């Protein structure tokens, strides 16, 4: 049974195939976000196109038919719109998005911005001199972003992205492709993927339905009805092997231990998939709740903190990890705390009071989210709608989210979660990870045999059931 989209959301398609999504919002008043979403990122690049989706994105600000060279930037600047502030763009594995935020009070400026979007759609020129200028830009940005977080992501990457197309398609690409790719090759990718049926224009902000629909139709319906190439899908394959990693980086600020599981990610488009996602989310929250209760009650002063989280790793896949942050260089205490909590849940699961508290506090938040919906952050709301568009999943209103949760969560029990926990714990696609920032913590890090001997020790213990306070 298909989920309804927010009552206030306006969706549709122009005759040329371009899709649009309009959502009214008046916080801040007289502000609108205009985003052009290309449903193609780095995943679709051929072996000789590594970083071309990202290079194409940069080329939108360096020449169009009406605005050659720096004229697109000079036009935005004449309307008080600055690159990196009001005007932005990004390329990910899944998409390329072009973003403009401006007031709604100057109608000629709204029209001017729409005229620029029309030319980014099919009239970018890729001038030789401009392409050559951007090679240096991309090369410098590639080096600049190589910080501790990037080095940690690079080290985790083979473990986290095993058997994904994402592993071979990091958006920055190769500097050797950036240096040699011809303007004709950049033009080829652009004309292959930048066609109306692979585009969604998103309007979020303080504009009425009639005016927003007219902005789109008056400026984007004349784009020729060309069909883009089909976006290919690479199904992620399980890696039924337990792996181990130690990330040693002196610039990282937190030492700790984590267990990562990799599993399919269901798209929330019906009642059954809404329940499946809610069960993984609740297992994650219940873990977090128990750890925080043990820390605040004073039971765990041997550790600093920790979390459980789910992360998207590919269009069809996710990782669920359980992390405990170490107190200084005390790697043994971190491992002990994590293993002890995972084994306690293995043996007794969660209580009816623990689940009842997670549900009631989430419903309280959801109810208040309905009451305060007019005050939602514009940027966050635009991002959620862009995400629904990318995943072809219904964009639920705060009211639908609240009503669905109140009704569908009654199918979530201590028994249904115990089943899901046992399934997750038998998942062979897993890896242990430790993070160290000095040679004392590095010497203290557990080797793989020690990790598993600690797991066996806890598995064979008759551990006591946790009692919700
Ligand atoms: Cl990247
Ligand atoms: Cl194994």
Author numbering: 27 to 495
Source paper text:
In Pectobacterium, iron acquisition via plant ferredoxin is mediated by the Ferredoxin uptake system (Fus), a molecular machine consisting of inner and outer membrane transporters and a periplasmically localised protease. Intriguingly, the outer membrane transporter from this system, a TonB-dependent transporter (TBDT) designated FusA, imports intact ferredoxin into the periplasm of the bacteria where it is processed by the M16 family protease FusC. To confirm the common architecture of these systems, we characterised the gene cluster analogous to the Fus from Escherichia coli: the ydd/pqqL operon. Furthermore, through structural and biochemical characterisation of the distantly related Fus homologues, YddB and PqqL from E. coli, we show that these proteins share key features with FusA and FusC, suggesting a conserved function.
We hypothesized that the uncharacterised protein PqqL, encoded in an operon with the yddB gene, is a protease that processes the substrate for this system upon import into the bacterial periplasm. PqqL consists of two clam-shell like halves, each formed from two M16 protease subunits.
